[PDB]
Design a protein around this ligand. Structure first.
Ligand SMILES: *Cc1cc2c(cc1C)nc1c(=O)[nH]c(=O)nc-1n2C[C@H](O)[C@H](O)[C@H](O)COP(=O)(O)OP(=O)(O)OC[C@H]1O[C@@H](n2cnc3c(N)ncnc32)[C@H](O)[C@@H]1O
Ligand SMILES: O=C(O)[C@@H]1CSCN1
Ligand SMILES: O=C(O)[C@@H]1CSCN1
Ligand SMILES: [Cl-]
Length: 381
């Protein structure tokens, strides 16, 4: 079969693209090194935050809101759980967080529904949080938590029912791009199509050279821990929120306990530089894994600092400016690139799937994706 479209990397972005293409009757092949969802890429550890008011930049808000609507649509189409509306709390020291400030500006610019709180008002509203009196906060009630492995599994099952094919456990090794066709090479055979979408996550850093691209991309080792917590404070059932917060030593994020799983925490602004083929995927092999998490919990969420119940090891892929790459290949209009999601892409994957399908089919998108241009100056050293 010569396909209409081949997607290389059927993860967060690729599987969403495959769903969008299959739903329009486009003959699609997706090829993945593993069998998504899996624990070797960037999409595991159960849960992902979706925010609308966006501290990385107000220009992301439209894509977040579209993505949110697409997640509700997915919820209605599958039996897997997709989204729970935890709300998202953002806080930091007053006057000392650009992230908090931009979150607040984004909410104002897009007339988002948020609550503003400070100091003891935070600790009063959410028993279990203990911030200093000089902290301030913005709480977004209508954002929340995605079950990311379920998202990918649902998109996969829906796409496959519509005739998409998923070739699993198959690494793409090389590419051959012509003006009117694309070709991939694998140990399980070679495949051709009219259009290519490249969405290989951390492996984009190693394999985009085979498309003659030289773009700084650094994979990072990013751990999360689940901790035994006071369920009377930290459970989703008592409205404990998702959160993403700035403190003097960086940004931390986390999740309420769901069904007694424990509060989940990660440290966002620090991780080890790694190669995705040699990363150590065991939690706790570095002392920082657990210690950086307990340093936050004992200070700010002291009843969520019990026994470590579970750990996970996942990867970010950062650009120099920490903005995504979503664009056509500059020399090949039949090749679409999705890369560099810099630790904050999952929430957009529904919307990005739609963009990637538009770019593959038409060479354009209705979305404004200027900030993710592959030709922008700030990508380069
Ligand atoms: C690691 C992580 C990320 C993260 C997060 C916490 C952690 C610990 N918290 C987030 C959050 O709360 N909210 C959010 O919006 N994002 C958050 N992130 C980031 C997010 O998870 C990532 O930005 C996103 O998952 C990136 O998706 P992408 O589609 O780029 O990556 P992937 O899901 O890993 O999929 C890539 C696939 O490609 C396959 N692959 C790799 N090499 C090949 C070859 N050669 N051939 C074929 N397939 C290939 C991989 O197997 C994978 O399935
Ligand atoms: O380490 C980093 O964040 C950057 C991302 S691309 C090259 N180095
Ligand atoms: O993108 C987000 O919302 C989360 C919080 S920092 C890690 N990812
Ligand atoms: Cl990432």
């Amino acid at each position: 079969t010569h396909f209409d479209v081949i997607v290389v990397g059927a993860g967060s972005m690729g599987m969403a693209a495959g769903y969008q293409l299959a739903k329009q009757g486009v003959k699609t092949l997706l090829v993945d090194a593993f069998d998504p969802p899996h624990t070797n890429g960037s999409h595991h550890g159960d849960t992902r935050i979706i925010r609308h008011a966006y501290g990385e930049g107000r220009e992301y808000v439209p894509l977040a809101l579209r993505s949110q609507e697409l997640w509700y649509e997915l919820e209605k189409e599958t039996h897997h759980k997709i989204f729970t509306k935890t709300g998202v709390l953002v806080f930091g020291p007053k006057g000392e967080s650009a992230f908090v400030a931009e979150t607040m500006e984004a909410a104002k610019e897009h007339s988002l529904t948020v609550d503003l709180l400070e100091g003891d008002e935070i600790n009063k509203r959410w028993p279990g949080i203990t911030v200093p009196e000089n902290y301030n906060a913005i709480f977004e009630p209508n954002s929340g938590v995605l079950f990311s492995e379920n998202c990918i599994r649902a998109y996969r099952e829906l796409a496959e029912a519509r005739g998409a094919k998923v070739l699993t456990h198959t690494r793409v090794e090389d590419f051959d791009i012509s003006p009117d066709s694309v070709k991939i090479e694998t140990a399980n055979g070679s495949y051709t199509a009219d259009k290519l979408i490249v969405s290989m996550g951390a492996w984009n850093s190693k394999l985009l050279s085979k498309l003659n691209l030289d773009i700084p991309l650094q994979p990072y080792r990013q751990v999360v821990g689940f901790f035994e917590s006071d369920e009377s404070k930290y459970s989703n059932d008592i409205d404990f929120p998702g959160f993403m917060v700035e403190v003097p030593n960086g940004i931390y994020y986390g999740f309420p306990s769901f069904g007694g799983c424990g509060l989940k925490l990660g440290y966002h602004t620090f991780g080890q530089k790694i190669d995705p083929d040699t990363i150590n995927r065991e939690f706790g092999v570095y002392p920082e894994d657990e210690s950086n998490l307990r340093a936050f919990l004992e200070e700010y969420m002291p009843g969520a600092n019990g026994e470590l119940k579970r750990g996970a090891v996942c990867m970010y892929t950062k650009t120099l400016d920490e903005h995504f790459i979503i664009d056509l290949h500059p020399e090949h209009s039949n090749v679409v690139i999705a890369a560099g999601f810099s630790g904050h892409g999952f929430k957009f994957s529904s919307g990005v799937g739609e963009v990637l399908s538009q770019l593959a089919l038409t060479g354009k998108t209705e979305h404004d994706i200027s900030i993710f241009s592959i030709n922008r100056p700030a990508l380069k050293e």
